[model samples]
Target: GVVAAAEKTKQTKEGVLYVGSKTKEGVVHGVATVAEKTKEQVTNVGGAVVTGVTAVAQKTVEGAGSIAAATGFVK
Candidate 1:
């Protein structure tokens, strides 16, 4: 590759959490410096990419209840 595009990193700074929150969604300490994500995380995410949206949606809905409960959210 000639030119590399900017990419995100895991905790580019220490002690940071990036996710949807009560205060804000997708909050960040600073802009992530350009770097490639690790192979393990990349590989784990590959199934959704290959299986496409329908599979991802199915998994998302199926898993959503458990995930919500684990996060201590209630309906």
Candidate 2:
């Protein structure tokens, strides 16, 4: 899930996890099966946090992009 919301042209993929199976699933390792529907409700809550992580990581990449592009393009 390469942050479909992000812009690689902005060079913001460096710190981005792109939501790999291992990466995304690893966090919710305990949430699965029919009972996961209960967790799915919890997911709405956790998903908010996940979105927060995305926002934070997105900014992280923006910062990385700034200096990285300077280094990559200016050099």
Candidate 3:
């Protein structure tokens, strides 16, 4: 809403390529902004995955510990 034509218009800046430009800087300009945002998303996504994986691992770890102490190292 603040950017006026931010995401409203098909193109924010006239010269800023639409991911379908010719010059190297054409893709560079738009992709640059998109790329920065991409890192943030990747970090967020990776964290969620790691967080879920850890939860599952903790469950297994706790179960294993319980079994180990159950019979005094029997198996």
Candidate 4:
């Protein structure tokens, strides 16, 4: 989804995932499903210390604009 809340050019995915745009060869590309934690650690941290995987679910991305528009928020 587009993050209108973002400052200028930024976007967040599904609340948990972080999306961003990449430029290469004069072309802008999109990055999907950012994982701040490793797959094991993200799950093993538990809800008490963490929010669990469900709280960390990431939204899928379709284009660079989508990622570039995402805000840096998970709520």
Best by lDDT: 4
Q: Note the residue pairs that clash in candidate 4.
A: 10-70, 11-70, 11-71, 12-70, 12-71
TM-score of 4: 0.13
lDDT: worst 10-residue window of model 4: 41-50
**Candidate 1 local Cα displacement, residue 66, angstroms:** 22
lDDT of 4: 0.34
Candidate 3 per-residue lDDT over residues 28-74, each given as its tens digit: 12112236435332212111122221122222232222111121223
TM-score, candidate 1, is 0.13
Question: What is candidate 4's lDDT per residue for 1-75, written digit by digit as tens?
Answer: 533332345575445545454545453232334566555322221112223222333433333322223234353
Candidate RMSDs in Å, in order, are 22.0, 17.3, 24.3, 18.2
Candidate 1 accuracy as lDDT:
0.31
Model 2 misplaced stretches (Cα beyond 4 Å): 1-3, 10-40, 45-59, 63-75
Model 2 lDDT on a 0 to 1 scale = 0.33
After the best TM-score superposition of candidate 3, give how far the Cα of residue 41 lies from its true spot, in angstroms: 14
Say which prediction, candidate 3 or candidate 4, comes out ahead on TM-score. 4
Error of 4 at 7 (Å): 37
lDDT tens digits by residue: candidate 1, 1-75: 223243445577644545442443453432233447643221111123223122223233232222111222244
Off by over 4 Å in 1: 1-21, 28-33, 36-45, 49-58, 61-75
**Each candidate's clash count:** 0, 0, 0, 5
Least accurate 10 contiguous residues by lDDT in model 2: 66-75
lDDT of each: 0.31, 0.33, 0.25, 0.34
Q: Could you tell me the lDDT of residue 24 within candidate 3?
A: 39
Give candidate 2's error at residue 26 in angstroms.
Answer: 23
Ranking by TM-score: 2, 4, 1, 3
